[PDB]
Design a protein around this ligand. Structure first.
Ligand code: GDP
Ligand code: MG
Length: 305
């Protein structure tokens, strides 16, 4: 019986609590504690499609050797679920996946769900710290945005990446590895196609710095590029009104929009295929499951005092 485990939470006193006992129970088990880890995080605001997406990532991780891992077209969705509260923090999946690479060594896959809002100036520090810790631990950060990538989205991205930099060890190269803009309800396929190719051209125009841009407009883009060695973008279509208006969607897979499943079938392996798995690195050293827990404990202690 696997499920989501609340690892990081923000108490009402605006302090940060890390469930170390739950962290150790998952990542320090003898079967996985000494294995190089890949940490994939889906980060975004509440009610933006994160749990619905990660249930399909689980379907892929539990059925990688199946062609139709998404499920039966005529039957409801099957498998474990994150969709069990608007809690600002980080959740991880209780089961760590051991993936045999094309090589002969087993790699560990950790899945993270990061949640928080940047709406008001009051809840800004709490969500910035949570999203910072998510970016510092994960090897791929999936920025889950809705409809478009707006300027405030980049400002917030600059905010929690700057929080993370101030706590990390100083590095000559870039501090983080992979950032991905996941635009969830893309409604302009006639400008940029659904998927990674359209997202690449879209993000190219968005994060382009030009001399006619405002000073604040270019400087936030210079910062974002300096933080990640790779930055990607995937334009995902709308899943349909049955998914959008149902809390915890339980209908048949047929009732999800066909274009959504088509691009979802290529989004998930684009993220989690064994060939694309890059080991998490901190300060230039490949991190193991045991080491990732140590950095999580070390980073959280810096933000407390
Ligand atoms: N418009 C839209 N709605 C979605 C999408 N994915 C899920 N939903 C629906 O929107 C609501 C989001 O809930 P959920 O994703 O579980 O919450 P979250 O994990 O905190 O973002 C649910 O009712 C879903 O059925 C999406 O890509 N676009
Ligand atoms: Mg969630």
């Amino acid at each position: 019986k696997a499920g989501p485990v609340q690892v990081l939470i923000v108490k009402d006193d605006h302090s940060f609590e890390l469930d170390e006992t739950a962290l150790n129970r998952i990542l320090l088990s003898e079967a996985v504690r000494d294995k190089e880890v890949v940490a994939v995080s889906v980060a975004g605001a509440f009610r933006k499609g994160k749990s619905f997406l990660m249930d399909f990532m689980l379907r892929y991780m539990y059925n990688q050797e199946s062609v139709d891992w998404v499920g039966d077209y005529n039957e409801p969705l099957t498998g474990f679920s994150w969709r069990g509260r608007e809690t600002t923090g980080i959740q991880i999946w209780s089961e760590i996946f051991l993936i045999n690479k094309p090589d002969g060594k087993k790699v560990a896959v950790l899945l993270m769900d990061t949640q928080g809002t940047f709406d008001s100036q009051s809840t800004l520090r709490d969500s910035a710290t949570v999203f910072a810790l998510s970016t510092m631990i994960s090897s791929i950060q999936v920025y889950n945005l809705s409809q478009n990538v707006q300027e405030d989205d980049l400002q917030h991205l600059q905010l929690f990446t700057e929080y993370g930099r101030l706590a990390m060890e100083e590095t000559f190269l870039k501090p983080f590895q992979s950032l991905i803009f996941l635009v969830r309800d893309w409604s302009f396929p006639y400008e940029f196609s659904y998927g990674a190719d359209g997202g690449a051209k879209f993000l190219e125009k968005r994060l382009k710095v030009s001399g006619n841009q405002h000073e604040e407009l270019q400087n936030v883009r210079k910062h974002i590029h300096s933080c990640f060695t790779n930055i990607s973008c995937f334009l995902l279509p709308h899943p349909g009104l049955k998914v959008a208006t149902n809390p915890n969607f339980d209908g048949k897979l047929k009732e999800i929009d066909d274009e959504f499943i088509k691009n979802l079938k290529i989004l998930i392996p684009w993220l989690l295929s064994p060939e694309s798995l890059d080991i998490k690195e901190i300060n230039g050293n490949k991190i193991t499951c045991r080491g990732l827990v140590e950095y999580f404990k070390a980073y959280i202690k810096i933000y407390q005092g």
